[PDB]
Structures are given as structure tokens and as C-alpha cells.
PDB file of C-alpha atoms in Angstrom:
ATOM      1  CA  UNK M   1      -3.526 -87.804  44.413  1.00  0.00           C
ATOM      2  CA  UNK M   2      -3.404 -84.221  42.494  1.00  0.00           C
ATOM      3  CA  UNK M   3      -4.618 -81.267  44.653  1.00  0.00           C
ATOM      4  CA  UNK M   4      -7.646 -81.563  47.078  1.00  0.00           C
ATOM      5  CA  UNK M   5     -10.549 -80.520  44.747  1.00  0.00           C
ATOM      6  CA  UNK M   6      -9.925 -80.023  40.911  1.00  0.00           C
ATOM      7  CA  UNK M   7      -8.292 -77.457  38.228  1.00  0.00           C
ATOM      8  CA  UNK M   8      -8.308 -74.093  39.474  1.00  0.00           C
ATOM      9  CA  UNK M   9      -7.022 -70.891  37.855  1.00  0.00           C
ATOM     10  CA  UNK M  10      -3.328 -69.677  39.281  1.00  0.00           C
ATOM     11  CA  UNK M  11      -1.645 -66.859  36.754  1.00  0.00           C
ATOM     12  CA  UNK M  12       0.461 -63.969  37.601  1.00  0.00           C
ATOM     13  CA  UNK M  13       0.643 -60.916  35.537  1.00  0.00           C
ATOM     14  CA  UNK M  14       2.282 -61.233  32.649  1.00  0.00           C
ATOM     15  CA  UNK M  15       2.419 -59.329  29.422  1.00  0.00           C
ATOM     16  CA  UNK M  16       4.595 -59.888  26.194  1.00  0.00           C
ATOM     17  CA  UNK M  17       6.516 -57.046  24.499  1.00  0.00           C
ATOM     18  CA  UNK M  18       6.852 -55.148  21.436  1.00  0.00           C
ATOM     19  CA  UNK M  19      10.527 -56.294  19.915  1.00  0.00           C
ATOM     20  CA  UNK M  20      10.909 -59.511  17.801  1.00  0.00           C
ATOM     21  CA  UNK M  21      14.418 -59.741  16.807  1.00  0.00           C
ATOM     22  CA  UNK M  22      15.680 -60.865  13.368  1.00  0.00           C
ATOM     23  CA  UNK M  23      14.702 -64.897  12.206  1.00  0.00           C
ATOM     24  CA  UNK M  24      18.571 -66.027  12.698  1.00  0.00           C
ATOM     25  CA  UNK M  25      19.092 -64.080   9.216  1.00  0.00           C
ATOM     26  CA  UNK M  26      17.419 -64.860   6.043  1.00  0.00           C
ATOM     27  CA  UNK M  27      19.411 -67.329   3.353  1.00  0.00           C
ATOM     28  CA  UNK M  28      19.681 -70.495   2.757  1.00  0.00           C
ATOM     29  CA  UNK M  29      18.330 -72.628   5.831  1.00  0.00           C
ATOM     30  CA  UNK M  30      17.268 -75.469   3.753  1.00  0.00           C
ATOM     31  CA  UNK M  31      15.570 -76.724   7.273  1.00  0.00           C
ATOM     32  CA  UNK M  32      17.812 -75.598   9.851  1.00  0.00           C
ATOM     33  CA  UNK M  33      19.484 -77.663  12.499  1.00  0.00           C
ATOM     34  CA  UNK M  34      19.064 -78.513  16.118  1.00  0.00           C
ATOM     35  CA  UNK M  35      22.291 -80.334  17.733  1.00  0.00           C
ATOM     36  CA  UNK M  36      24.090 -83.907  17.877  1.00  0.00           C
ATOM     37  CA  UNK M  37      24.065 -84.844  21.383  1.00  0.00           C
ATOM     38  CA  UNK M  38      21.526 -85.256  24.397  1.00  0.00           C
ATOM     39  CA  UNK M  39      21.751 -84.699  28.142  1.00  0.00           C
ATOM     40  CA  UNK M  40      23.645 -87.232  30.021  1.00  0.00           C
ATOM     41  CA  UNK M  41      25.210 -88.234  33.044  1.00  0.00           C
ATOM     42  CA  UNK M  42      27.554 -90.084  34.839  1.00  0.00           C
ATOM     43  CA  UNK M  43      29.224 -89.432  38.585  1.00  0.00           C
ATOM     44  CA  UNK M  44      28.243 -86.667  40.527  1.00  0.00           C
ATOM     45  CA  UNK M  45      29.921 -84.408  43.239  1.00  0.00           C
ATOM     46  CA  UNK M  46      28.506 -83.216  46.605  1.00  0.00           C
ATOM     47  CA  UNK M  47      26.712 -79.983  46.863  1.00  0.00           C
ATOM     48  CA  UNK M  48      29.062 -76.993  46.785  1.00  0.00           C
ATOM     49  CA  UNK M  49      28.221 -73.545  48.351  1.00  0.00           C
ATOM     50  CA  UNK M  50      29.075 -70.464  46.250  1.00  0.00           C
ATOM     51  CA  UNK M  51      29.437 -67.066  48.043  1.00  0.00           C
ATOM     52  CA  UNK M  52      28.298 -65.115  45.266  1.00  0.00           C
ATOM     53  CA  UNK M  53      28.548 -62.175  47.845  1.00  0.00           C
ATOM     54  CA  UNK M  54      25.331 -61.375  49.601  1.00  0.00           C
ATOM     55  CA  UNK M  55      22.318 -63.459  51.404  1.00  0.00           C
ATOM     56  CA  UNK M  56      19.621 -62.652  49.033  1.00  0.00           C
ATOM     57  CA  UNK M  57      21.881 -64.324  46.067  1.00  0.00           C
ATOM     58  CA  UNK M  58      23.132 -67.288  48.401  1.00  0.00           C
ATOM     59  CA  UNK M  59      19.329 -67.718  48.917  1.00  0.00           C
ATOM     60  CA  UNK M  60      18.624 -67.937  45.221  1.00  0.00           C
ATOM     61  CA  UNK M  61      21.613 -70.278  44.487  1.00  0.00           C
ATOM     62  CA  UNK M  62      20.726 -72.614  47.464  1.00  0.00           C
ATOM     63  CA  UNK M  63      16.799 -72.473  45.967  1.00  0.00           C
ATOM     64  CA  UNK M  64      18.206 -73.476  42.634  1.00  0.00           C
ATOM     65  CA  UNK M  65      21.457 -75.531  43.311  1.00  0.00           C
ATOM     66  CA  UNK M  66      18.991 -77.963  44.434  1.00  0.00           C
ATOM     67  CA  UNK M  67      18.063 -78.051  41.337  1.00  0.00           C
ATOM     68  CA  UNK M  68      21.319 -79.739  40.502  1.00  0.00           C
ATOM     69  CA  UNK M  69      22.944 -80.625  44.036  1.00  0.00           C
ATOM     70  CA  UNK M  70      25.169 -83.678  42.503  1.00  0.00           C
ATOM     71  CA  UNK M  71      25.203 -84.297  39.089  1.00  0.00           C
ATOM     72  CA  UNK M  72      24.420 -82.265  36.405  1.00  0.00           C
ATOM     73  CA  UNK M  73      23.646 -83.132  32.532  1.00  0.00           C
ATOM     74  CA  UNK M  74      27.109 -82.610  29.910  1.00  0.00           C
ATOM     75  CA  UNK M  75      28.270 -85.259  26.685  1.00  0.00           C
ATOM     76  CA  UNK M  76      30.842 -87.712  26.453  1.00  0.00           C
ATOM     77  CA  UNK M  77      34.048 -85.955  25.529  1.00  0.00           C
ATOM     78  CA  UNK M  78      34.947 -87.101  21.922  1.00  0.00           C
ATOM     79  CA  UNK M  79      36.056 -83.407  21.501  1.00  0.00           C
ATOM     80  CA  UNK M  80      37.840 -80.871  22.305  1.00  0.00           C
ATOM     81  CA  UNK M  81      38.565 -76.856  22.103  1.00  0.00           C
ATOM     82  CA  UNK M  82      39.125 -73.899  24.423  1.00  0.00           C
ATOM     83  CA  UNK M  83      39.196 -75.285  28.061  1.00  0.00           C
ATOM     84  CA  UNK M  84      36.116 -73.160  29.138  1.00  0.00           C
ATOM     85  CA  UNK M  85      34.265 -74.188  25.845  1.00  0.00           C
ATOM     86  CA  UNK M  86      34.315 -77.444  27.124  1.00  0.00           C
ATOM     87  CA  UNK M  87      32.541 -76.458  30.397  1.00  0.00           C
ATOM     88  CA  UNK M  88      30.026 -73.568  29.009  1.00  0.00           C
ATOM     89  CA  UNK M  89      28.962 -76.645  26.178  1.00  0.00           C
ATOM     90  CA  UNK M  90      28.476 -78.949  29.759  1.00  0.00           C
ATOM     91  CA  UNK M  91      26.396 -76.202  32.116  1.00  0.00           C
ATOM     92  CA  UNK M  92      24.915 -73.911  29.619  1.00  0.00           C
ATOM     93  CA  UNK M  93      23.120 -77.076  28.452  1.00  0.00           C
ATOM     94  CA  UNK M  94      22.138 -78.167  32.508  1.00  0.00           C
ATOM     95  CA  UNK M  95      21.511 -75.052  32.777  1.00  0.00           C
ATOM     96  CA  UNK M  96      19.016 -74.984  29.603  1.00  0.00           C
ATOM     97  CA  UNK M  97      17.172 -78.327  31.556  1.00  0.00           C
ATOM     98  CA  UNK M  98      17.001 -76.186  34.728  1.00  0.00           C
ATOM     99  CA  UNK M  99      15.567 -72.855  33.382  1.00  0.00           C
ATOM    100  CA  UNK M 100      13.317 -74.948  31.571  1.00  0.00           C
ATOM    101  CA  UNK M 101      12.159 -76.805  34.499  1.00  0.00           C
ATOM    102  CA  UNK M 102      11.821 -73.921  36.946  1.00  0.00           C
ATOM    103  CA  UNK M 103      10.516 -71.538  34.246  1.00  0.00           C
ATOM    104  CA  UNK M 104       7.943 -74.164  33.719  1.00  0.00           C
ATOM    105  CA  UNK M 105       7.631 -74.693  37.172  1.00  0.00           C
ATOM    106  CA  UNK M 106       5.918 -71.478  38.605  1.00  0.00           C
ATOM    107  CA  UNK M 107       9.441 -69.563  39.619  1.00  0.00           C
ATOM    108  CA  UNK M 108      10.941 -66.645  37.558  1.00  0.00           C
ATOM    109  CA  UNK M 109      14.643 -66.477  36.550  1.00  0.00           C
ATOM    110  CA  UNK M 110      16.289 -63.087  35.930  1.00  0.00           C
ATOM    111  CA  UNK M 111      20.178 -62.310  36.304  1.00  0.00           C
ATOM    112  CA  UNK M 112      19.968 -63.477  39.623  1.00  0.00           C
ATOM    113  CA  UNK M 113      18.839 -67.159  38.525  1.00  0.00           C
ATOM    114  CA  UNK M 114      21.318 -67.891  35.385  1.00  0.00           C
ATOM    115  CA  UNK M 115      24.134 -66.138  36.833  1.00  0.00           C
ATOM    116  CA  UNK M 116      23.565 -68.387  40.236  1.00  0.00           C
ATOM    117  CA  UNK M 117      22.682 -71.693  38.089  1.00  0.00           C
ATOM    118  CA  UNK M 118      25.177 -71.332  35.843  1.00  0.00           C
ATOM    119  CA  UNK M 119      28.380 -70.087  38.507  1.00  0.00           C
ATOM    120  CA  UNK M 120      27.423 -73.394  40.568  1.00  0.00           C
ATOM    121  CA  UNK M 121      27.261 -75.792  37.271  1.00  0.00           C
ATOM    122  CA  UNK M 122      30.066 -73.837  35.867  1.00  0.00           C
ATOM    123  CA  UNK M 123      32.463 -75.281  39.014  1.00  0.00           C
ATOM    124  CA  UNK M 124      29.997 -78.374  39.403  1.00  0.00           C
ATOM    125  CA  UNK M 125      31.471 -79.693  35.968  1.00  0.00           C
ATOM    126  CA  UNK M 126      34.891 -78.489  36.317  1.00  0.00           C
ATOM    127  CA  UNK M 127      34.330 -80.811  38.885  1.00  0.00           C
ATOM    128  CA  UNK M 128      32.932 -83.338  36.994  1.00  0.00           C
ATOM    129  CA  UNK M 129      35.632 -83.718  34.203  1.00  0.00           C
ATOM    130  CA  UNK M 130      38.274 -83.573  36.815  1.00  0.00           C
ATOM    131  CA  UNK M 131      36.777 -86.951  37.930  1.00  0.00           C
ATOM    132  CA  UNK M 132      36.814 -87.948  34.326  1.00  0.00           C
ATOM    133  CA  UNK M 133      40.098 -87.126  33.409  1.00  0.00           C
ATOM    134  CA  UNK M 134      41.533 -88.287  37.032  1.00  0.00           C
ATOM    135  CA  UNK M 135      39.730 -91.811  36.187  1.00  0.00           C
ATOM    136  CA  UNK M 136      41.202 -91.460  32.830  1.00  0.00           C
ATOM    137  CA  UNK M 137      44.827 -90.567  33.999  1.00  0.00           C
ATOM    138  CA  UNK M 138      44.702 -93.921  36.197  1.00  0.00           C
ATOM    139  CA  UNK M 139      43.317 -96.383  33.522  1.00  0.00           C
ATOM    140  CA  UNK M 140      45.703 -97.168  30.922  1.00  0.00           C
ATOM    141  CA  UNK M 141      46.611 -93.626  30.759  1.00  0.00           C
ATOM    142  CA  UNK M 142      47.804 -91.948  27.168  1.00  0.00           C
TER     143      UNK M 142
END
């Protein structure tokens, strides 16, 4: 049941630009690499409300914390570093899913979006591995 009628043609402006960075350097990249892991999830929390500190950004991270309103996509731990390496690793990646799904969408994402998406998955996660850890400090503990 796709839209009454058939393919139409919806596209708003858009132009490219004139800056092309540098191609990640220029040595030996033998086929470069990607990344050992994939999205994954496990237990999720309820849907938190971040006063960034006006209406027109609570709008924007309501719009989008939708977009991940309980759980949100991180890897097993077998690791660790920094403390807030841990949690960029676990919503800069959600966050990669989500501006790739509302990118694709038919929605734009500026400062507004990514700083929104990520502040709410940032805390989401903490979250998260605070249920992981608790659960962790109760089983046979270490």
C-alpha cells in the first residue's frame, strides 16, 4: 500500500560545494579498514527529557529522541579506556544509525540535530552500562 497514485518527484534545493579535503593521507593503505564490531543491543531505559535550554532545541531533541526513546545501538564491553571513550564509541555509533536514517529520511541535521542526538544517547548509555555493570556487580561479582 505505497502512496495513492505512483512515483512522483519530491527534491529540495540542494547544491554540493567546492572543498574536498585530503584522501585520509596518502601511504601505505594496502586496502584500508572499516571496524570490528556491529550495532547491538540489549536493555533499554525510558525516554529521558534533556533541557538543552530553549523550546526550539527541546523540539528538535523530542523529534529525534524518538528516534532512540529506549534503547540505543553500543558493543559488548570486552574493553576498556577513558570512561567517556567508552560512551562516545556507544552513541557516536547510534548516533551514526540515526543521522543515517533521518538524513535518508527527508529531515536535515545541522548542530542542532547531532548535538541533540548525541547529548540524549550520550546520558541514554551512561544509562545503559550502569544497568550493565549494576547486573554485573550482583552476579558473581569480581
Amino acid at each position: 500500500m505505497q502512496g495513492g497514485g505512483t512515483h512522483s518527484q519530491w527534491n529540495k534545493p540542494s547544491k554540493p560545494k567546492t572543498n574536498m579535503k585530503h584522501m585520509a593521507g596518502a601511504a601505505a593503505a594496502g586496502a584500508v579498514v572499516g571496524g570490528l564490531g556491529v550495532y547491538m543491543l540489549g536493555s533499554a531505559m525510558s525516554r529521558p527529557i534533556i533541557h538543552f535550554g530553549s523550546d526550539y532545541e527541546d523540539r528538535y531533541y523530542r523529534e529525534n529522541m524518538h528516534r532512540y526513546p529506549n534503547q540505543v545501538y553500543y558493543r559488548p564491553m570486552d574493553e576498556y579506556s577513558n570512561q567517556n571513550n567508552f560512551v562516545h564509541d556507544c552513541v557516536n555509533i547510534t548516533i551514526k544509525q540515526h543521522t543515517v536514517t533521518t538524513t535518508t529520511k527527508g529531515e536535515n541535521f545541522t548542530e542542532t540535530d547531532v548535538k541533540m542526538m548525541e547529548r540524549v544517547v550520550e546520558q541514554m548509555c551512561i544509562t545503559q552500562y550502569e544497568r550493565e555493570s549494576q547486573a554485573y556487580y550482583q552476579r558473581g561479582s569480581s
